[PDB]
Write a protein that binds this ligand. Structure first.
Ligand SMILES: [Cl-]
Ligand SMILES: [Cl-]
Ligand SMILES: [Cl-]
Length: 261
């Protein structure tokens, strides 16, 4: 009876999905896939693969599902099917603890830009005047880069970087006073030893503009989408996602109801 589906991942984006000794895949998405497959009553094989042909391999029926921090976009929806989201994009600020900026009492608030925009707009105003005149770092060509441009332009000096590590290295130096980045990336980076003193400050921002992550499936595989959708829904309500999210990321990525069928 039981379905045997192959799940593809990148294997090079810790703590979401990362490589092992001979071939042991680990991370948030691996523990989540194992959990969803148990909810589905399916046998699953997780394979790591270069993103290049992940993709023609899925449309070619070599793979049946993709779990590689894959954002739902209008372009991807034209070519592939998507499950309901299993993670929502979250951005936050990090400063050095010994700095006067380390006390934005907006900790540890979490505001949706879609369902709590009122609380979000009031919070970004509190921040814009606290951060007034400061040099804020960000990785160029991201949702955090766009967010900082839309709401924090004029209030702060914005410096774009080509990696999170490069802006984090200039925060410890004093070159930058604050960084804004994906909260899963940020909490991981501040665990590095040359990153001691740095801490997550102010509120967490979630919303559709930060994107959402879901399972990539064949556009024709409507039954597999129905199976993933039921398991994702159950994993969201019983707190399986919150658990794994906090375990790997120290932040809760569980999405909201409005990102439904
Ligand atoms: Cl584990
Ligand atoms: Cl098959
Ligand atoms: Cl959901």
């Amino acid at each position: 009876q039981e379905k045997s589906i192959t799940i593809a991942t990148e294997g090079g984006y810790a703590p979401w999905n990362f490589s092992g000794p001979g071939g042991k895949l680990d991370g948030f998405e691996i523990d989540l896939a194992n959990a969803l497959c148990e909810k589905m009553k399916a046998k699953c094989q997780i394979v790591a693969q270069n993103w290049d042909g992940i993709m023609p391999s899925l449309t070619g029926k070599k793979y049946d599902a993709i779990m590689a921090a894959m954002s739902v976009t209008p372009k991807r929806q034209e070519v592939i099917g998507f499950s309901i989201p299993y993670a929502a994009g979250i951005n936050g600020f990090a400063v050095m603890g010994d700095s006067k900026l380390a006390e934005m009492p907006g900790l540890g608030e979490t505001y949706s830009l879609d369902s709590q925009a009122d609380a979000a707009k009031k919070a970004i105003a509190d921040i814009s005047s606290f951060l007034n005149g400061t040099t804020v770092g960000v990785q160029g060509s991201t949702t955090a880069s766009t967010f900082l441009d839309k709401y924090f332009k004029g209030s702060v000096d914005i410096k774009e970087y080509k990696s999170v590590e490069e802006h984090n290295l200039d925060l410890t130096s004093g070159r930058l006073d604050a960084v804004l980045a994906n909260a899963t990336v940020l909490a991981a980076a501040i665990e590095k030893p040359e990153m001691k003193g740095a801490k997550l400050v102010g509120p967490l921002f979630s919303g559709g503009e930060f994107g959402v992550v879901a399972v990539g499936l064949r556009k024709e595989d409507t039954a597999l989408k129905a199976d993933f959708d039921a398991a994702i829904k159950a994993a969201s309500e019983d707190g399986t996602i919150k658990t794994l999210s906090l375990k790997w990321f120290k932040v809760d990525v569980t999405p909201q109801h409005h990102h439904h069928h």
